[PDB]
């Protein structure tokens with residue numbers, strides 16, 4: 001051996017390749033622990049996620065296996081890409097821990113929202129988000145949890161989408177980065193229990209987009225019921241056509257709420273909150289608002305697609321087919337994940353996935 005060394009991190013032990021130095025805990029939960037580290041070989045800072053014996057039970061096992069498999073299906077600069085996957089254990093019989101390495105970014109979108117962004121920066125961030133989303137969707141992956149804390153950035157305005165769910169509990173949780181609840185970013189079709197398609201993510205991008213402008217959460221409801229009130233208060237009561245797709249109980253609840261005409265987007269998102277130094281900013285403001293009005297549509301059938309959004313005048317200035325059309329290596333298949341496995345089998349599946357990386 002002599003490849004691995006151990007360090008005390010949290011209430012645990014990180015046994016990692018000697019190339020990873022200066023480990024500092026930055027995130028913790030029941031499903032995983034993330035440290036910042038310096039990669040001496042790459043000469044860069046990295047983030048190392050430890051999954052501690054992910055096979056310990058059925059819930060942990062399926063989540064560890066799903067993570068490894070999902071990350072196997074993606075290959076895009078605007079999505080988390082693994083620099084390394086390893087285990088310090090040498091055989092299956094003794095296999096215990098899995099370590100995932102990614103590039104350390106500078107900040108998450110939470111820390112970007114209350115900065116003075118211009119149209120060029122805003123449209124570029126949005127462009128990258130859309131590129132990332134398009135890649136995921138073509139890989140058969142709906143994120144479902146697109147929110148500012150799941151989006152990471154560097155000082156050059158480059159951006160990546162990830163999923164920093166660690167199944168956090170009272171004892172386990174610790175964060176060196178801001179967190180925000182998913183609720184504010186859930187599409188109405190999710191809220192109302194409708195069953196959904198990939199464009200739930202487009203709704204989330206519109207919420208994120210609006211927040212980048214206003215500096216405040218767009219639909220800040222106290223709970224899932226209240227989210228709906230905040231949606232209709234601004235966008236207005238949805239169509240009978242939309243309500244017809246609801247289950248009878250949810251349908252009647254929705255029909256019982258006060259009727260709202262909806263606020264004009266020129267009024268919800270006024271010129272003054274946008275950059276306006278030049279005549280060209282005025283043009284860009286109109287484009288941004290138009291794109292916003294097409295993402296924040298209650299009915300997913302009437303909501304803009306990622307394809308259309310990438311072609312929108314606000315976004316298309318950045319369009320490069322090498323980025324916005326890059327295909328994923330394969331489409332995610334949930335078959336082996338949704339198979340039932342004894343713990344020993346999950347152990348071997350996860351093991352093989354690591355050794356194969």
Ligand SMILES: Cc1ccc(-n2nc(C(C)(C)C)cc2NC(=O)Nc2ccc(OCCN3CCOCC3)c3ccccc23)cc1
Pocket residue numbers: 026027034047048049063064066067070071074079080100101102103104105106107141142143152161162163164165177
């Ligand atoms: C159960 C489960 C299943 C799937 C996922 N999942 N799904 C996706 C898609 C949808 C985007 C493909 C991605 C992921 N997984 C992740 O995004 N995992 C990670 C999150 C946060 C991290 O570190 C955050 C710290 N941050 C890193 C960037 O630099 C600043 C600090 C990580 C650090 C190292 C390795 C993995 C990390 C997650 C969980």
